Amino acid sequence: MAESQVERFTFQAEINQLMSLIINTFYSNKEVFLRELISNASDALDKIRYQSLTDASVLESKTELEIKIIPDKTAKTLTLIDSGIGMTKTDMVKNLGTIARSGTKNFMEQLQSGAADISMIGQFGVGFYSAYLVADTVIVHSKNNDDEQYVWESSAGGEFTIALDHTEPLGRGTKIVLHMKEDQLDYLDETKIKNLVKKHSEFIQYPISLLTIKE
Numbered sequence: 001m002a003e004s005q006v007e008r009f010t011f012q013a014e015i016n017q018l019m020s021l022i023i024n025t026f027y028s029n030k031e032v033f034l035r036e037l038i039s040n041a042s043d044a045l046d047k048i049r050y051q052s053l054t055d056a057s058v059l060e061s062k063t064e065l066e067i068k069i070i071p072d073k074t075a076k077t078l079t080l081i082d083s084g085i086g087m088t089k090t091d092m093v094k095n096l097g098t099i100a101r102s103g104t105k106n107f108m109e110q111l112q113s114g115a116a117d118i119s120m121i122g123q124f125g126v127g128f129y130s131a132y133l134v135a136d137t138v139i140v141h142s143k144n145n146d147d148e149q150y151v152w153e154s155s156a157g158g159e160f161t162i163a164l165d166h167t168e169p170l171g172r173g174t175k176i177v178l179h180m181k182e183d184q185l186d187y188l189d190e191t192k193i194k195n196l197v198k199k200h201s202e203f204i205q206y207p208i209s210l211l212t213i214k215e
């Protein structure tokens, strides 16, 4: 018998509204989700890299600074792994849903007005939630040097959970798993995802490994 303590949290009200808007509205082009995933990974990698300039020991948990992308058609998942800074449990609580972001309301208003489209979500400090354009459930595993490995999970509906993660140790960094919506499984096609990764990684200064899994 396995035992696990799970803590349940409620999304900040405006973040809840945004997630509802992202999930319950048709958007023609949803490619932004991948740009946001890679962007976040690159930012996380920059953070640990600059920390290592002033403190070399911070890299001992995992020497390589890299991104891995794994489309898994059988599992119906897209996974992105980075060896960036990672998030502590409290980092996840704060950054992944409970704290208000000042861009949230203004983004929603601009979406409704036509002043902004969904592709601009990253400019408003809420890029993470673009994952729900293509995924029903998002799982975020993370390991920061300061904490144990934790896993954040949400299928929206106003709540998320966080628990200690006893799955494969990351060493350091973040593994985000998108459980893809049936109508968005095209994003797992080998050539399509290859192309999109190349397109959305032109300025990314870390190696990217694209691993196509077949069963």
Ligand SMILES: Nc1ncnc2c1ncn2[C@@H]1O[C@H](COP(=O)(O)OP(=O)(O)O)[C@@H](O)[C@H]1O
Pocket (backbone or CB within 6 Å): 036, 040, 041, 043, 044, 082, 084, 085, 086, 087, 095, 096, 122, 124, 125, 126, 127, 128, 129, 173, 174
């Ligand atoms: N791969 C990751 N590694 C570390 N932290 C992350 C990662 N992805 C997201 N985060 C955290 O979640 C926050 C929200 O990301 P996002 O909504 O894209 O806003 P922004 O990138 O503008 O900060 C980030 O600022 C970061 O603190």
Ligand SMILES: [Mg+2]
Pocket (backbone or CB within 6 Å): 036, 039, 040, 122, 127, 128
């Ligand atoms: Mg971001």
